[PDB]
Amino acid sequence: TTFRFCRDCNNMLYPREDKENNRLLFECRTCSYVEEAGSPLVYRHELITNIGETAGVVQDIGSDPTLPRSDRECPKCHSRENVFFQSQQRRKDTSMVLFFVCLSCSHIFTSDQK
Amino acid sequence: EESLDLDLERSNRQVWLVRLPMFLAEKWRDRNNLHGQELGKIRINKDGSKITLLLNENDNDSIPHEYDLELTKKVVENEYVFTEQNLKKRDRYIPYVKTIPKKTAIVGTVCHECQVMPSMNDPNYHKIVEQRRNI
Amino acid sequence: LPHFSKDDYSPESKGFVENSYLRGLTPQEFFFHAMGGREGLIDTAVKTAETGYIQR
Amino acid sequence: DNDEKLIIRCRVVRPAEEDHMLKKIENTMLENITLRGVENIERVVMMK
Amino acid sequence: DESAPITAEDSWAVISAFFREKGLVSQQLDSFNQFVDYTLQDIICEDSTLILEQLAQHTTESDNISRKYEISFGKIYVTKPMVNESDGVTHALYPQEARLRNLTYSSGLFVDVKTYEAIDVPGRELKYEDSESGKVFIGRLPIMLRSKNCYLSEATESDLYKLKECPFDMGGYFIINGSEKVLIAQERSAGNIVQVFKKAAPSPISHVAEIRSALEKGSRFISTLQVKLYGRSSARTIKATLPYIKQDIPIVIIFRALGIIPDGEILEHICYDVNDWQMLEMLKPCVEDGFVIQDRETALDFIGRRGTALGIKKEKRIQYAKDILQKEFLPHITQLEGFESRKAFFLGYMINRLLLCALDRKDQDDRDHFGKKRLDLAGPLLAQLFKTLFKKLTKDIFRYMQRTVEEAHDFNMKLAINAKTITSGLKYALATGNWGEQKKAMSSRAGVSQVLNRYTYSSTLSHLRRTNTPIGRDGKLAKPRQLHNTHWGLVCPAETPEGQACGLVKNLSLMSCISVGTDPMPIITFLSEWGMEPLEDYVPHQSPDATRVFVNGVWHGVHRNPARLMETLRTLRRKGDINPEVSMIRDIREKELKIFTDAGRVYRPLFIVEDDESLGHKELKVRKGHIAKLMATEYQDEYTWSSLLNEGLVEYIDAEEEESILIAMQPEDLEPAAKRIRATTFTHCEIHPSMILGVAASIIPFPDHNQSPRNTYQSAMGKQAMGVFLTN
Amino acid sequence: DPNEYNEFPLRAIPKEDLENMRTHLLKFQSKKKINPVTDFHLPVRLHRKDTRNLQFQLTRAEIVQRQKEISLRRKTRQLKVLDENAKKLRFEEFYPWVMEDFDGYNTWVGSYEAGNSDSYVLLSVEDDGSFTMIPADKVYKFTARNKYATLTIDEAEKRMDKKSGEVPRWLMKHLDNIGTTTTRYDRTRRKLKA
């Protein structure tokens, strides 16, 4: 779903169809540069999703004091130290799922006990 | 009398843009100075990658005599120094455009963006630390 | 409240008064009690004028 | 229903410039086509 | 031992020192002292220019001489209260004298006032460019009691009784026509700060972002900027409103006109994580809207007329548009000529914040949060009135100088009527309660100069630290009347009146202090010196993780390491090299850094806790030796609260920071490993919980052990009790 | 220290040489490296010109070819104060810096940014090994223009009017087929052909 831009100018390449060769082309509607289409994918919507929960996972998450600490272990380093926080997606229909990041292994993993 | 076209000859000269700390910039940007006197010495590694400045004793030991020069951008592109001075005294086109001609010439190419920082280990250094702390 | 760790839903963290008047409250619980009292005060202080208009 | 990916494949019949027109079609499909029930009614609860 | 920890009991000594130093009315006193020491020479030297160089008023006339009429004001002067009666000498006043004689405990002013020419007949040109007295009287203005320039601010108890007034009269009221007079704080939403709103569904706008601005306080520079998101659908489009442009304008046109032609750059100014896409998808229609224009001045060529009368024009001057965008647009971060890029980055930041709310990534803004408000006080209010009356002064000075086409320059007598105007205006403002000149009560909120209550010493003290906000006549029922979490430890949660004003008037807690502001220039210079990326050469690609930096709500640069800068600033503050009123916050979740040094913030003291400890787990830095020294100093009848501040033992916290600090209620609550019911990462411990009250509630014994509305009933009622109010 | 380095004291530029001469800093916004001496078609002229209707402006080669082919007051006034240096800056920036090569292949428009002009100081190595110290008074930034044959303002105003819900996705392609408003390099090439 990524967008490409003209090498000659940072401008959105609009897909357009080859009438005779029947393959999608991306032409810079600013300047005559044209480009081949990597995938038949053109536009992507994703009306409902469960993404964006890994937003703002800075390397300094453990630095802040206010995030609570737990005793669960990361299944890479098993160090009981870790920092946990709930879903970043602030909508009324969210879930009580939590996210555990451990300072030692610097890895993020879900709270799913299943 | 002078050719309006700019000179392209003096381009091929490497230039080092230097960001300078306020105290030292105040001294060097003064028009009263700049008589051509030497002011400091530079140290370059044969291996490279580390540059430090050896300031002369003309500073009156009020500021560090040693500084480290850090190349913020080792490689620099599309940056140049051009100099200006006064000259001697669907197909429709616009005839009058009010051109204003000046004598111009490009004199150098910027290749190294670097900043002067006082070496904390310098004995005269860390004094400007308190000076900046007060201000 | 800035005396709690983030993202807690324990009753004390989110404002459950545990103690009784006999022993006396705790700073946080005191604050929450103040909140409730203020709510009651303001709601009545507005409804009085409103419902007076309706009555008239 | 045998397939586990609930997918619909449609194409415009005409005997070209698909972006705007087909996005309009998609919006119409999403916010115009009712399925069952009567509009102006929302979640309904069963009570004993 | 001296390095032993501190029992919760011992905290009281610290409080004793803090009061012994600060004094309760410190807020009002310091506001006035600041307004007198500065902000007055500033307000004059700012606009001290007025010249009438009548060279020839037309070409020649051969030539004539450049008849400069240069008048400028140098240093100003203030006097002790020094008032003469009719037909008599001037007395050295004293508060009781004015109080019984119905005077105004004011003092006079007089300011210095400052031809040699350049001549030009037509060709060449561009080089064609008085006092009559000194320190001319300009008027008299009232004074704050026990201010820097009040007689009482140095009295000794013996001398204080010689002057015959009660030593317990701590408090800065005013004496107007012989009546104790008090001004009250006015809270207002802080300016120059990004906010977003979710407007109601029926309107074609769903999400809006608003910016306020000011210059402190020329022309009032309201200059509201707001960006609206249209449609619910493909009507997704973003338009902005700018003065003096009276159409909604597509933001892409704004970017292009600013000087950013290639669309990819504009995308870089909005989106930061190139990996994410959703924002690009919702921007797609906006990019489509501006697909037609491809040049900066052509975008500038858009009319946005709103007037005034079209001067030199073809359709719209490019010069007109650029002069708008520089001089008037966004009166903050810059307004001079040459910082288009700063404008672009800030506008992109605000667009991004707007877009998040529509994308549900971040929640709705909270208007009622306390920190994003401020408390205007005596200083700023007197500043506003003085500015208005001095503008009237200058306009009148221009008059009667143009009138004296013939001889001569007065320089003397008009300023007498001017002094009458200035003094009359100040007197009227401070006595009537209306706030402004005789403008038929326009914009004149009355509750600014209430009459000081004098029934009970408790009441009197409970009338100084008072606040008020304008909301409406009748009142709403879902807005700041109800208490808020942010109010903790800053405003007393029980000392409020009831009825038609409940929750509006509110009362400062005990140690709460107000921010008097400080020049940010040294701070920003220091920050740049220690390594800053000026935004002029920023690039998101090479900075996928760098942290933005804000000062008083201006973006200045981006930095790589926030941690070291944070600790360095903290240490430098604690060492006392920065005014402690300055507050900084590191929003590590948002990758953001804030610096605040404006005036009018509210802050409280706190114990600092060092996480590290050679003795073991964790410990607050102060020890027993310091408190022993404090007790010794007190009983001497030389540690001060300031002397506690310098060496890093307690630190001020504004209302904004708490969102980045964890607090320990008791100094022993969890520090180590029936009566009643009772993490390991604390940074600060409360000095004492009982200090969250205000003046009146403090009297209530065991306020914990009874219902809160009953405490509110008593807090209100106690002010209606007799007893003593002074001794004189 | 052991001689692992080249030491030489940098020397200042002579004071008397500096006066009456102004030195500025030049910047290009471009993803690809551009070398003025090689890429540009000499002769190259730097002029301070009004930028209105840049496309309609004839190329320097075109101009040379054309030349060869030819061969009551109110009496009471008050002025608000403005800083003299600010007034001079406004006067100088009233016209932008515009640089063109003879061919007209590449055109660049400069702008002035005051963010770091004062703090930055020029240092370039002299022939003897000294480093020339220059206080940099102003820094100018140049951007490319007219490379993509931009459309004109009036037709753009007509398009933005809501005559159509969406403008033709191939409007630029159709205009290029009509070849309206050819590039300055294209116009110069056509003139040279004629």
Ligand SMILES: [Zn+2]
């Ligand atoms: Zn292109």
Ligand SMILES: [Zn+2]
């Ligand atoms: Zn692990």
